[PDB]
Each structure stands twice: as structure tokens, then as C-alpha cells.
Paper text:
Most eukaryotic proteins are N-terminally acetylated by a set of Nα acetyltransferases (NATs). Here, we report Naa50 homologs from the filamentous fungi Chaetomium thermophilum and Neurospora crassa with significant N- and C-terminal extensions to the conserved GNAT domain. Structural and biochemical analyses show that CtNaa50 shares the GNAT structure and substrate specificity with other homologs. However, in contrast to previously analyzed Naa50 proteins, it does not form NatE.
Residue numbers in the entry:
A (entry chain H): 1 to 5
B (entry chain A): 81 to 294
Write the structure that this text describes.
Amino acid sequence: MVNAL
Amino acid sequence: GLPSGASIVPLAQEHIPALRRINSLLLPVAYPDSFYHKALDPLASGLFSRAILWQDTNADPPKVVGGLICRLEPNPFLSVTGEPTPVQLPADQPQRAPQAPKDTPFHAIYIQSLALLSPYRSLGLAAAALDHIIATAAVLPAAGSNIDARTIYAHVWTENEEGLKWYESRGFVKEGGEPVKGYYFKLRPDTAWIVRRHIGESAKLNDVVHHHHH
Ligand SMILES: *C(=O)CSCCNC(=O)CCNC(=O)[C@H](O)C(C)(C)COP(=O)(O)OP(=O)(O)OC[C@H]1O[C@@H](n2cnc3c(N)ncnc32)[C@H](O)[C@@H]1OP(=O)(O)O
């Protein structure tokens, strides 16, 4: 799960 | 062998609404629409991304039950001559990917999102999607690609034991000795492990872990 950047 | 009714395909526009719903149900980071548009761009996240489809009966159109959205990047785990190296995590840029060496010839595949609805779990579907990605990376050079994907990696929230267990079972290792602080903007805790698996011509390095970083 990548961050929302 | 895939269970009857399952298929794995390159992620396409028709799968996005459903995969976005699945991610919204299973991953506690809200992604903006741009994330899903980039997942369709072969130059952004539109090469290694995969949909996991299910048909209950042969009369049903296959429906999305899970997927992996992935992005190609310069490889941040290897030197420009292929040695395993500790990762570089600039302290002012924790929400950014680990920094790769300038002008490296090696690539990494970054898994941005992984999700599978619970009725379809424990059937090897996500593992099969991962294997399809790895096999795609292996055959791309023979097809004339300049992509040399030597590692697959992801961030895993430190509270997500389900995900951590899956990545460990697939041969990934935690890299850097500690999770990334301040990785997530709104989630509490905001920490995430970097997990990585070396593949292809670098697969022999998979067991070489650095328990520190730069
Ligand atoms: C950022 O997005 C990265 S971190 C976020 C990860 N996602 C997440 O947490 C969302 C919610 N959870 C899930 O979606 C789900 O729990 C997964 C996708 C993380 C894992 O789902 P599964 O556990 O069902 O994983 P699969 O790979 O689909 O199945 C693996 C298990 O299936 C059995 N099996 C049967 N044949 C197999 C073959 N050929 N190869 C491997 N495994 C096979 C096994 O029982 C296997 O169990 P393991 O314990 O080996 O995983």
C-alpha cells in the first residue's frame, strides 16, 4: 500500500 | 494450476471501477483518481499491473475480485554494477520512494496496491499474479525491452499482519532495519516496512538483507 503522494 | 473460474490478466480500463472499489474496501489509504488513471498508462503504472478475475459459472462474464497496481522505477537496492546495497532514505523525503543511484541500468517493480476480496483467498490467486509479473519481467528483454527488473518491492503498514505474512510467504524480506517513519499522511501509526524480493538475474541476492540504511 503506497501512500497517497 | 488456477482454481476453476479464476484468471489473471493485464489491468485494463474496464477493470478499474471494480478494483478501485476493492481497494477502497481493503486498503485504508484513499487514492485520488490520478492514481487509477496512471494505472492505465504503460509509462506510469500500466505495464505490470494485473487484474484477478472470477467467473462463478461458464455463463458469467469474468468479474474483478482483486488486483495488483504496479509501477516501474529505477532500482534502489543495487549499485550500478549490481551489488546489493543498503537503501538510501533521505530524511526530508520519507514519503518518497527510496532513492536509486543516478543513471542505474537496473529497474524495480513497485507494488503500489495489492488487494483480494476475502471469499477468493487461500487459492493462490495473488501469488499467481505475482508470478505472472515476475515471468513478464523475465521475458521482456528477449522481446526487445530495455527493462531489466531485478527487484519487486512494496510498502507494508506496520499494523498489517495479513500483508506482512503474505509478502514473507512470497519470499520478500524487510529491508533497512526499521520501518519508514512518517510514510503515511493520515494513518496511525504512520509507519511502513519496505519489503523486497530480488528476482531474475539478481535472484541469488534475495537472502542478502541489510539491517540498516543510509
Ligand atoms: C500495499 O498495497 C502492499 S501491503 C497491502 C496488502 N493487502 C492487504 O492487506 C489488503 C487485504 N488483504 C488481502 O487482500 C489478502 O489478505 C492478500 C492479497 C494480502 C493475501 O491474500 P491470500 O492470502 O489469499 O494470498 P494468495 O496469494 O491469493 O493465496 C496464497 C495462499 O493460497 C494457497 N495456495 C494455493 N496454491 C498456491 C500456489 N501455487 N502458490 C502459492 N500459494 C498457493 C496457500 O495456502 C497460500 O498460502 P500462503 O500462506 O503461502 O500465502
